[PDB]
């Protein structure tokens, strides 16, 4: 009788460890669906689609080259310098 | 023609949908955490199966320990006035309980690590679970920003310049 | 009860001995800081 | 009043009971301070609206 | 408060618990900085669009 209940005492623990085992395993066996690598490729490759498709924009409207951006900032530098010098010249 | 095509044949409408859903992870992405929520609560309830059981042994040893206290007390009372002969048996009966207490008590010590670590496991898992659920919206928001960022310009090319503008400036040539 | 109490115990983690140590220690500081201040008023 | 004439032992418990209330007052009092901003700003919101 | 009156032993654990939070704050705080560019640029994108 003591052995009978003793065996019945620890079955729940292993069963609880079993469901903990099933839980410990369903938790992580499912966790691998979107962790990293090809799993994350499910969205970060769709993030790559942004750039596959952004290049269509980049190609369709060629990005302002560093020269024109250089012209833009240089023109801004001339625009501010020409203006601020003129603006402060008014007070003078 | 083949199962992959005949499984396709029966699922031509579904194979497309399955490919589309896996191509656009909105449902599976949302319900995997919802499904993962099921195992978390299942772990929540399954974990409880460990918690109540282990101490239930703790109460049992206490009753036996108290009984061992009774035999210890009975032996303490029995041995009075030099009646050691009577108390000798009572101590012998106690040793039967002492074996039960020692074996059961140590079982808790290792079981503490199981509950302690598994609680730590869930403690780490829950933060990671919500952390993964925290950034999914950002990528989804960036995804809809991506779809929006792309539908905005993919459609914008209909009448920008060249043959696109030819739709009217060639009519201007008309 | 305890299978289901663990749901409470798990849902609201029981105040750890450290926080209980903090609670009683704070009470020890609370009483000592107060009683010292309270008796200091008469002085 | 309890601590009078050196009867500090009796007054020790009363102070202990007080600390239970002191926790209630401090937590509830601060809640008003932020709630003032909510009513203050929302009144400003409606004032602007 | 724990380290007062030379009770550094008690306060040592509390600081240890704090480091767990400090890791959370530092990692999450920086995530905003790059996200500001995302909202800042996308707002600029729409502003231009």
3-class secondary structure, A24: helix
Residues of E within 8 A of C29 (CB-CB) are 1
Asked if residue A8 belongs to a known ligand binding site, the reply is yes
Here the tokens at position D21 are: 């209330």
Of the candidates C23, C14, A6, the residue with the CA atom closest to the CA atom of residue B115:
C14
Element (H, E) at A58: helix A38-60
Please calculate the CA angle C34-C35-C36 and round it to the nearest 5 degrees: 90
Asked if residue A68 belongs to a known ligand binding site, the reply is no
| Residue C27 · residue B65 · CB < 8 Å | no
CB atoms within 10 A of CB A12: 17
Here the tokens at position B172 are: 């201007």
Q: Is the dihedral of CA B84, B90, B92, B97 positive or negative?
A: negative
Residues of B with CB under 8 A from a CB of C: 44-45, 47-49, 51-52, 55-56
Here the tokens at position B64 are: 């036996």
Burial code (b: 16+ CB inside 10 Å, e: under 16) for B10-23 equals eeeeeeeeeeeeee
Enter the resolution in angstroms.
5.3
The nearest alpha carbon in chain B to E45 belongs to B149
The nearest alpha carbon in chain C to B42 belongs to C7
Element (H, E) at A63: none
Residues of B within 8 A of C5 (CB-CB) are 52
| Residue D3 · residue C39 · CB < 8 Å | yes
| Residue B36 · residue A31 · CB < 8 Å | yes
B138, B145, B152 ranked by CB distance to E49: nearest: B152
| Residue B154 · residue A53 · CB < 8 Å | yes
d(CA B100, CA E24): 47
The nearest alpha carbon in chain C to E14 belongs to C18
Here the tokens at position C23 are: 């609670």
| Residue B145 contacts E where some CB pair is shorter than 8 Å | yes
Please calculate the CA angle C32-C35-C41 and round it to the nearest 5 degrees: 135
| Residue B103 · residue A3 · CB < 8 Å | no
Of the candidates B57, B70, B59, B79, the residue with the CA atom closest to the CA atom of residue B97:
B70
| Residue B152 contacts E where some CB pair is shorter than 8 Å | yes
Taking an 8 Å cut-off on Cβ atoms, the answer to whether E35 and B145 are in contact is: no
Solving technique for this entry?
A: cryo-EM
Asked if residue A33 belongs to a known ligand binding site, the reply is yes
Residues of C within 8 A of D16 (CB-CB) are 27, 31
Q: How far apart are the first and last CA of chain A?
A: 110
Mutation to test the E interface, candidates C13, C25, C27, most E Cβ within 10 Å: C25
B48 to chain C, closest Cα gap in Å: 6
Chains linked to E by 3 or more Cβ pairs within 8 Å:
B, C
DSSP string, D1-49: -TTGGG-HHHHHHHHHHHHHHHHHHHHHHHHHHHHHHHHHHHHHHHHH-
Give chain B as a 3 state SS string. Answer: CCHHHHHHHHCHHHHHHHHHHHHCCCHHHHHHHHHHHHHHHHHHHHHHHHHHHHHHHHHHHHHHHHHHHHHHHHHHHHCHHHCHHHHHHHHHHHHHHHHHHHHHHHHHHHHHHHHHHHHHHHHHHHHHHHHHHHHHHHHHHHHHHHHHHHHHHHHHCCCCCCHHHHHHHHHHHC
A23: burial class by Cβ within 10 Å (0-12, 13-18, 19+)? buried
Chain position carrying tokens 């952390």: B131
d(CA A82, CA D28): 61
Residues of B within 8 A of E38 (CB-CB) are 142, 145
Burial code (b: 16+ CB inside 10 Å, e: under 16) for D14-26 equals ebeeeeeeeeeee
CB atoms within 10 A of CB B88: 12
The nearest alpha carbon in chain A to B43 belongs to A23
Chains linked to D by 3 or more Cβ pairs within 8 Å:
C
């Amino acid at each position: 009788e003591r052995k009978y209940l003793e065996l019945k005492s620890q079955k729940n623990l292993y069963l609880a460890r079993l469901k903990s085992a099933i839980a410990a395993q369903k938790i992580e066996e499912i966790a691998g669906n979107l962790d990293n690598a090809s799993a994350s490729s499910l969205f970060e490759r769709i993030e790559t689609k942004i750039l596959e498709l952004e290049a269509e924009r980049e190609l369709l409207n060629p990005p302002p080259s560093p020269l024109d951006k250089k012209f833009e900032q240089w023109e801004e530098q001339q625009a501010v310098e020409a203006t601020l010098a003129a603006m402060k010249a008014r007070r003078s | 023609m083949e199962l992959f095509n005949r499984v396709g044949r029966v699922l031509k409408s579904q194979l497309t949908h399955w490919q589309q859903q896996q191509e656009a992870p909105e449902d599976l992405l949302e319900r995997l955490l919802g499904e993962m929520e099921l195992e978390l609560i299942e772990l929540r309830r399954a974990l409880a199966q460990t918690i109540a059981t282990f101490k239930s042994t703790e109460r049992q040893r206490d009753a036996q320990q108290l009984i061992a206290q009774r035999w210890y007390e009975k032996a303490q009372a029995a041995l009075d006035r030099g009646n050691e002969q009577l108390a000798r048996e009572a101590l012998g009966q106690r040793q039967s309980y002492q074996s039960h207490t020692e074996a059961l008590g140590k079982s808790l010590g290792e079981q503490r690590a199981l509950v302690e670590q598994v609680r730590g496991q869930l403690q780490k898992l829950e933060r990671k679970y919500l952390e993964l659920k925290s950034q999914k919206n950002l990528y989804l928001a960036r995804l809809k920003s991506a779809i929006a960022a792309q539908k905005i310009e993919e459609i914008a090319g209909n009448l920008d310049n060249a043959s696109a503008s030819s739709l009217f400036e060639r009519i201007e040539t008309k």
